[PDB]
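Re: your question about Fatty acid-binding protein, adipocyte

S., sorry for the slow reply, the queue was backed up all week. Below is exactly what I fed in.
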Amino acid sequence: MCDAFVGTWKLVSSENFDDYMKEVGVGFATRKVAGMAKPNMIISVNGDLVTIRSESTFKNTEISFKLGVEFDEITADDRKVKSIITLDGGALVQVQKWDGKSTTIKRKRDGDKLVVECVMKGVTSTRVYERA
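Result:
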């Protein structure tokens, strides 16, 4: 399950992430630190349970989830959200909902890349990772 996503991924490019974070509501200082971070993303699967870790000097976070089962999450910027992650067309699609708001984070395999597209109210950020 989700075999293609398994690995340790290193950030190679980031586009429009500051604007994305502004739209989400991330504070100025936090945006500054999060933006200069070069996280690794470590994805693993154990049976039906997927784990995604994000590691950097900014923060270390981890989520463990089952596809299609809503779960509670504290994000790296300290929002308490309800998250649902689905596999749609080979892409892992995560929707986070909080305070009447929503954002979508799509993780897709493209060649030897993992491409992460984050969208909120039509503001989009794209982060590309490659295997470490």
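The helical segments are 17-24, 28-36. The two ends are 21 Å apart (CA to CA).

Happy to talk it through on Thursday.
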